[PDB]
Design a protein around this ligand. Sequence first.
Ligand SMILES: [Mg+2]
Ligand SMILES: [Mg+2]
Ligand SMILES: [Mg+2]
Ligand SMILES: [Mg+2]
Ligand SMILES: [Mg+2]
Ligand SMILES: [Mg+2]
Ligand SMILES: [Mg+2]
Ligand SMILES: [Mg+2]
Ligand SMILES: [Mg+2]
Ligand SMILES: [Mg+2]
Ligand SMILES: [Mg+2]
Ligand SMILES: [Mg+2]
Ligand SMILES: [Mg+2]
Ligand SMILES: [Mg+2]
Ligand SMILES: [Mg+2]
Ligand SMILES: [Mg+2]
Ligand SMILES: [Mg+2]
Ligand SMILES: [Mg+2]
Ligand SMILES: [Mg+2]
Ligand SMILES: [Mg+2]
Ligand SMILES: [Mg+2]
Ligand SMILES: [Mg+2]
Ligand SMILES: [Mg+2]
Ligand SMILES: [Mg+2]
Ligand SMILES: [Mg+2]
Ligand SMILES: [Mg+2]
Ligand SMILES: [Mg+2]
Ligand SMILES: [Mg+2]
Ligand SMILES: [Mg+2]
Ligand SMILES: [Mg+2]
Ligand SMILES: [Mg+2]
Ligand SMILES: [Mg+2]
Ligand SMILES: [Mg+2]
Ligand SMILES: [Mg+2]
Ligand SMILES: [Mg+2]
Ligand SMILES: [Mg+2]
Ligand SMILES: [Mg+2]
Ligand SMILES: [Mg+2]
Ligand SMILES: [Mg+2]
Ligand SMILES: [Mg+2]
Ligand SMILES: [Mg+2]
Ligand SMILES: [Mg+2]
Ligand SMILES: [Mg+2]
Ligand SMILES: [Mg+2]
Ligand SMILES: [Mg+2]
Ligand SMILES: [Mg+2]
Ligand SMILES: [Mg+2]
Ligand SMILES: [Mg+2]
Ligand SMILES: [Mg+2]
Ligand SMILES: [Mg+2]
Ligand SMILES: [Mg+2]
Ligand SMILES: [Mg+2]
Ligand SMILES: [Mg+2]
Ligand SMILES: [Mg+2]
Ligand SMILES: [Mg+2]
Ligand SMILES: [Mg+2]
Ligand SMILES: [Mg+2]
Ligand SMILES: [Mg+2]
Ligand SMILES: [Mg+2]
Ligand SMILES: [Mg+2]
Ligand SMILES: [Mg+2]
Ligand SMILES: [Mg+2]
Ligand SMILES: [Mg+2]
Ligand SMILES: [Mg+2]
Ligand SMILES: [Mg+2]
Ligand SMILES: [Mg+2]
Ligand SMILES: [Mg+2]
Ligand SMILES: [Mg+2]
Ligand SMILES: [Mg+2]
Ligand SMILES: [Mg+2]
Lengths: 393, 46, 240, 339, 122
Amino acid sequence: AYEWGVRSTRKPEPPPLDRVYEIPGLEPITYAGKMHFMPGLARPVFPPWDPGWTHPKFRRLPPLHEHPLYKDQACYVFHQRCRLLEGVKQALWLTKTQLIEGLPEKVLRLADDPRNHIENQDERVLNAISHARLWHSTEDIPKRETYCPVIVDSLIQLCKSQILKHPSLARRICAQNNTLSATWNRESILLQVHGSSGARLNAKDPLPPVASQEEVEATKNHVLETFYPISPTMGLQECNVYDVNDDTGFQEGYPYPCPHTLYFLESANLRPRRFQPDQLRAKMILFAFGSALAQARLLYGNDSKVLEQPVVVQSVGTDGRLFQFLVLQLNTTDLASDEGVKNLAWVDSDQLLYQHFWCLPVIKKKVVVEPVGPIGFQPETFRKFLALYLHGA
Amino acid sequence: KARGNEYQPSNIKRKHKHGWVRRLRTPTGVQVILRRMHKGRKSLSH
Amino acid sequence: ATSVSWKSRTKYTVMPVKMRKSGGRNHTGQIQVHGIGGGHKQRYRMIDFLRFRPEHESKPGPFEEKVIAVRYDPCRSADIALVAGGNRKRWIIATENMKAGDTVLNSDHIGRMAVAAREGDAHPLGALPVGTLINNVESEPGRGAQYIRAAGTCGVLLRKVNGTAIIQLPSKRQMQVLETCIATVGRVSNVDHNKRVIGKAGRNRWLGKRPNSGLWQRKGGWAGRKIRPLPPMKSYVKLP
Amino acid sequence: FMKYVVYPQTFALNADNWYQSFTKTVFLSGLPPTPAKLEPEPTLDITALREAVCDCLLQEHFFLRRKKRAPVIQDREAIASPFLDQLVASLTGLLSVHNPVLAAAALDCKRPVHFFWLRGEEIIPRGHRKGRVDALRYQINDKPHNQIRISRQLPEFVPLDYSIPIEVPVMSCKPDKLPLFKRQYENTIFIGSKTADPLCYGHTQFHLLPDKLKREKLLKQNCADQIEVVFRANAIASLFAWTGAQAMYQGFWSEADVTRPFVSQGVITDGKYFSFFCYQLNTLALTAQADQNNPRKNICWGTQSKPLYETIEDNNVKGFNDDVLLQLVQFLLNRPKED
Amino acid sequence: GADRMSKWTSKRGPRTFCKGRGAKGTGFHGRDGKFVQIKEMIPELVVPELAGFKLKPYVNYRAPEGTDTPLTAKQLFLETAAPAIEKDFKAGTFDPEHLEKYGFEPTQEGKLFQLYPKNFPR
RNA sequence: ACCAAAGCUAGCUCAACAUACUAAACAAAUACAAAAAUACACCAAAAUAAAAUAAAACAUUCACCUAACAUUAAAGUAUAGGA
RNA sequence: ACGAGCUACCCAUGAGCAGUUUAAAAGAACCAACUCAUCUAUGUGGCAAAAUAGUGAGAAGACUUGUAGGUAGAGGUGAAAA
RNA sequence: CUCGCACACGCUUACAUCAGUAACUAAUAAUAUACUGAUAAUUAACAACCAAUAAACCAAAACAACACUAAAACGUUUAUUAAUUACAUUGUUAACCCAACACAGGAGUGCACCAAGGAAAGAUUAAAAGAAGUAAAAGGAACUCGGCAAACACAAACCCCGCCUGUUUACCAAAAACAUCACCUCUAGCAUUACUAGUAUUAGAGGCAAUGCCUGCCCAGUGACACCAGUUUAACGGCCGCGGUAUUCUGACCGUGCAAAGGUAGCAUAAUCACUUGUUCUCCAAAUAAGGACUUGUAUGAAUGGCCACACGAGGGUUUUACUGUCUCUU
Ligand SMILES: [Mg+2]
Ligand SMILES: [Mg+2]
Ligand SMILES: [Mg+2]
Ligand SMILES: [Mg+2]
Ligand SMILES: [Mg+2]
Ligand SMILES: [Mg+2]
Ligand SMILES: [Mg+2]
Ligand SMILES: [Mg+2]
Ligand SMILES: [Mg+2]
Ligand SMILES: [Mg+2]
Ligand SMILES: [Mg+2]
Ligand SMILES: [Mg+2]
Ligand SMILES: [Mg+2]
Ligand SMILES: [Mg+2]
Ligand SMILES: [Mg+2]
Ligand SMILES: [Mg+2]
Ligand SMILES: [Mg+2]
Ligand SMILES: [Mg+2]
Ligand SMILES: [Mg+2]
Ligand SMILES: [Mg+2]
Ligand SMILES: [Mg+2]
Ligand SMILES: [Mg+2]
Ligand SMILES: [Mg+2]
Ligand SMILES: [Mg+2]
Ligand SMILES: [Mg+2]
Ligand SMILES: [Mg+2]
Ligand SMILES: [Mg+2]
Ligand SMILES: [Mg+2]
Ligand SMILES: [Mg+2]
Ligand SMILES: [Mg+2]
Ligand SMILES: [Mg+2]
Ligand SMILES: [Mg+2]
Ligand SMILES: [Mg+2]
Ligand SMILES: [Mg+2]
Ligand SMILES: [Mg+2]
Ligand SMILES: [Mg+2]
Ligand SMILES: [Mg+2]
Ligand SMILES: [Mg+2]
Ligand SMILES: [Mg+2]
Ligand SMILES: [Mg+2]
Ligand SMILES: [Mg+2]
Ligand SMILES: [Mg+2]
Ligand SMILES: [Mg+2]
Ligand SMILES: [Mg+2]
Ligand SMILES: [Mg+2]
Ligand SMILES: [Mg+2]
Ligand SMILES: [Mg+2]
Ligand SMILES: [Mg+2]
Ligand SMILES: [Mg+2]
Ligand SMILES: [Mg+2]
Ligand SMILES: [Mg+2]
Ligand SMILES: [Mg+2]
Ligand SMILES: [Mg+2]
Ligand SMILES: [Mg+2]
Ligand SMILES: [Mg+2]
Ligand SMILES: [Mg+2]
Ligand SMILES: [Mg+2]
Ligand SMILES: [Mg+2]
Ligand SMILES: [Mg+2]
Ligand SMILES: [Mg+2]
Ligand SMILES: [Mg+2]
Ligand SMILES: [Mg+2]
Ligand SMILES: [Mg+2]
Ligand SMILES: [Mg+2]
Ligand SMILES: [Mg+2]
Ligand SMILES: [Mg+2]
Ligand SMILES: [Mg+2]
Ligand SMILES: [Mg+2]
Ligand SMILES: [Mg+2]
Ligand SMILES: [Mg+2]
């Protein structure tokens, strides 16, 4: 084949030993006695230096098999920045769920109801968008890494402004950078969603199941579509050190146990550094599935069984102007066999909050053709976000 | 156009072209240092 | 001073790795090739020329992969394609009519029956019909595809005698190799590269071609129309 | 032109007095006089507020499982910053029922506030411009942890022409010995948003002290009286910059001096301790040619440091102070006038 | 051109050149880019109690000086170890195998302040 | 009358003898970009002397030309030389 | 032996081009910053061992330019002016 | 009148205070940021030093919605180890750097065109000559090699040469020279430092120059392949005499000789030896100027390329007005 290493840039082979060292029963005369190099003397060979006292910073990195957590079976870890080739498809295969395009019926009813709306809805949303895109920074054109969290938090505060009308949102608390670990064996493959997310909302009360028994039973007749050339473990990190333990972000006795909504942000200035919408949807699927697994295994146990009370979680992913909403209902724990019940998911994708934003007034032919502000505005995305926020109450 | 200002000072360039390490990294620079010491120069290099 | 090459990367990477161009300069610093330098900034896409490369040694049989995307490569005149199969992705040279979401088969099995050669297949020369069009041909079994790669160029298999395959290269020269050598069937992508027109002198500078010297050199004896006989067959089969 | 860079979170020994000299502000210990004409509104749930605060404490200190922190020192930056954010959010959500303004308010999370002003004259000592008069310029670029911005300005605490026997401290020395250093860059006046933002006024600021200004750090540096001075300097710089940004967004400057006072509330939080300040900007003509006949002075009301909890251990809060919670409640329930 | 007779210091270089003036380091660089200072590396000045010390920086002029007799190894041995070894030899208890009791040390790596390696600054 | 002029000293040169031959100072730092206390390496190398000149040109040739054998003769002899 | 801190060409890393006509960032057009130097007049031991004033060409590109490095004379480099 | 503030690079105290200047420096005085003596100074938050090892990662920056080609620097997460304990070290002045000088020169970046920087005149008279500016009767290029310079204009055209943008003799030549897209040749079947991490639709050594019509004959000589024959001119390069003839000028034609072919198409007094100011027509009152025609140019000529064409050019020539001190003739 074609070796990808170059002999000129690779580490050089040690120089050939001096002719003295091949003479049996003869002691070479080297310059090791004077502690410096001098021509005419043989090259001394030194034993591997052993620092009898171990120093933390200047010692060699221990090998992987020396770690106490090293295991023979390689586990496929899914962390925060994992990319999936066939994102939605591989996510559905690995999580054992059936996908639905539209949002759930109760979410639609809560969203489309004008009573649950904000006092000045369109104006407050436009003000939040303008503040995030232009007003929040002293620079003329703020970066995505700046205005993605700003717009997400502005929408969160806009939703929080409804706590006056609904005195039930106080049962929730936000959380930042909590470790999530959910490992499961599916089709003799050990997968594990392990990492940390952007933001996580937790609540005291559980989220009621949304999928009806008719849909649950019809899910039995659904078959997951398979991809032959690509293995389901595409894009996952094959790791050899791990712990098979359902570690949620919190310890025991937490007052706000049930996760309500995950918040994912694609705060990256470069398109290659950002996620594709498909991969972002896959990431949200896997992270919500991990959270639901943690909750189910702390409530019911580690046994693989169908849940009589399904665990439903929500997730929102924000590109800065594109929103992806997801409601995942976990109904079963046994994922080794594919003949059982499948979980359910409603994935509302490609939701544009606004078409384009002009931070500066464009002037064509000495006149202003388009003023400052967002061109195109879809309030339905915000309505769906508000429905997801108020879904608990 | 106008000449005579061909010397644009730069300490990094001065030390990398006529510095002590640059002089000693080659045998010819070592011989230059030897000649300067034999002549008795107060400054062997920059 | 002596410069260090930029090609220090042992591990295969799908993502484009940045490269440091050198215009006609060797490791010393003198010009060895004239008319090279001052090009556009480019990255290098790692191309796996060894097409038949199983992921795991447990299963050495023929394997099927899927085409993901056909993209442009500034390094070579051809258009490259990302292909994923098993647990790893790799860049290969896309043939003429490869599109996104296509099936590719890579086999080394030779049988008494020729395999119906599609455009994405990679079969050894012994399993292909007597007169097919091929590219990325190989010199020794397992060596890798050093030969035909340019856009639109393709050789033709002529005959297979005594367990040995003979092909015709784009230079109309006959090449004799073992029948085990893995080759890809079809023409290389971007067949219209020969028909492209450079619009101005600036496009050559964008590609990285310094203009030729102005020294007027009188033509010597080398100049003129030399009608030569075709060179003999180049054989790589080592007869005992 | 050249200007000084005034840092709110400063390591200078006695910087509150220097900031007072720069600002023409007088510091009064204790709360401002309470407007006792309030309606019998505060019937809130002190138990529920304590429960929320303790839940935030326990979550950010013991409950939240994060990555294994190899330094065993357990720096209080990453422990208190999420705690401060969650405490502000929970308090705003809980007290928005009593105060409708908090619902319509906007919460800024680590968003800078910039201010640039002039103060006094100075003869240039060195350079080719020696012997000529140059005005001293100061700039404050603060990064408050949490900000609350509202639609209508909060009411004043004392009248515009309110007089105080205490005079502003004046330094008979150069500002370079604080130490302060001159720098030249973009001099911006920023409130937390651009001028096009409809919320041209704000409600309260939150400032988290850095690890550099810890009580243990100051004690090791042999500084015990400067613990309160750090809070005083932080509040005096931050609230003054914030009110000056408000005034200059409303349109007042040196020759267009402010007509109605601009009031400010600030909560400065250490890892364990809390402190509260109230700042009232009345005069903005701090330049030499307009300060000749200016009787008004800025006022900064300050409170001494007071801890909230005490050595919480194993998901159980040992000590708790209700007075700090009540002070935070009053700060968050202060409301603009209705008309 | 530039000057060569003046010493090459940190002031006459670019921003990337910042050379120390001869002071000893007091630590290393940590994780977040900060400097971590080690309290073991800083010199701890061991100062005595001068309250009950009845000695002055100057001497009485009428006091006489002494004939210059620099201390030497043989004299130090005579004042310290010679009487002890002489007494042991007179008593018959002198042991050539073990000389540690007279003040001699076999190796230096054992004690804290060593002589040949010079582990103490002053 | 200004400008000016004159000292006899510092010291140098050639030899002989001579111990036997890189002077003194080296507390700290010195081939990181020298005078910068402190971290897992690479270290290193040799391959004829040439020509300016003379032969009135210039090609073969042209002593001395940084390699010990010194002095008195043999002797500018035998020899080597586009002889 | 010493020289690529000026210059000829490359190699890494950065930075600039405002306004106007134009579906155009088109090796387009006008004209700034900026880069070159067509013509003339002074200057000719001068401000200057190559300048000043007027006037000119390019001005989103084969464009300028900052820092660091490389190619060293029987050679280097050169859109050949030895 | 308006090149000011700061930072980077560079110079090192030339910076600040007090005192003195008879002399030394300012190209002269006053006095002093540029001379002398003494004493002090630049205090870090800005900047320098400021983790490695494996894995997930094709999807540009240009308000980035989404696209073009020339395919494009700028990043997080996971896992293993990262001394753990205040306060470390260094640059902080300036009127300054490179040019022998306190030099009208050369100098990167962010801001504004003044809210900051400075003074063309040492004092007189107002000779000639010189440089710069303004204005001018009537004329309006009649001056001159040339409409060079200047001008209340700042337009329309005809030719030569190069297609065009561009580059070149730093310091007498910026071009008709070079390069250029396009078209042709030759040289190479291939791996770890150029070419190239490429594979004949590729990469080098070259010629000529876009495009349009084309590129006619020759291997006799010298080169190159073929190791001899033989092939090559888009290889180095060459492509004819003598004499008479139709009815007077000519010669369609013929005889004879040598060649490898005897200069084909085209253009033509040209940037093309001399005769040349070739002959003729237009332009002017006058023309060795310019343009169009005739044409053996016996020394034009077809990729050392021949012919025309749009756009283009501080390239070189010729006109029409408008314009003016270039000039009548200067004041
Ligand atoms: Mg010089
Ligand atoms: Mg290439
Ligand atoms: Mg290509
Ligand atoms: Mg060429
Ligand atoms: Mg040429
Ligand atoms: Mg010098
Ligand atoms: Mg320096
Ligand atoms: Mg500097
Ligand atoms: Mg420290
Ligand atoms: Mg001679
Ligand atoms: Mg002679
Ligand atoms: Mg001679
Ligand atoms: Mg000789
Ligand atoms: Mg002979
Ligand atoms: Mg260099
Ligand atoms: Mg250079
Ligand atoms: Mg422009
Ligand atoms: Mg242009
Ligand atoms: Mg000029
Ligand atoms: Mg003029
Ligand atoms: Mg122009
Ligand atoms: Mg032009
Ligand atoms: Mg010669
Ligand atoms: Mg040469
Ligand atoms: Mg020439
Ligand atoms: Mg010549
Ligand atoms: Mg100097
Ligand atoms: Mg004087
Ligand atoms: Mg002085
Ligand atoms: Mg300064
Ligand atoms: Mg005068
Ligand atoms: Mg006169
Ligand atoms: Mg005149
Ligand atoms: Mg005039
Ligand atoms: Mg007139
Ligand atoms: Mg005339
Ligand atoms: Mg005349
Ligand atoms: Mg003119
Ligand atoms: Mg004209
Ligand atoms: Mg005109
Ligand atoms: Mg002519
Ligand atoms: Mg041209
Ligand atoms: Mg054209
Ligand atoms: Mg050039
Ligand atoms: Mg030039
Ligand atoms: Mg010239
Ligand atoms: Mg020109
Ligand atoms: Mg010129
Ligand atoms: Mg040409
Ligand atoms: Mg053709
Ligand atoms: Mg042509
Ligand atoms: Mg021809
Ligand atoms: Mg021939
Ligand atoms: Mg022949
Ligand atoms: Mg003709
Ligand atoms: Mg012609
Ligand atoms: Mg003609
Ligand atoms: Mg002629
Ligand atoms: Mg003429
Ligand atoms: Mg004429
Ligand atoms: Mg004529
Ligand atoms: Mg003519
Ligand atoms: Mg001819
Ligand atoms: Mg010719
Ligand atoms: Mg020819
Ligand atoms: Mg030519
Ligand atoms: Mg021109
Ligand atoms: Mg012209
Ligand atoms: Mg040009
Ligand atoms: Mg007159």
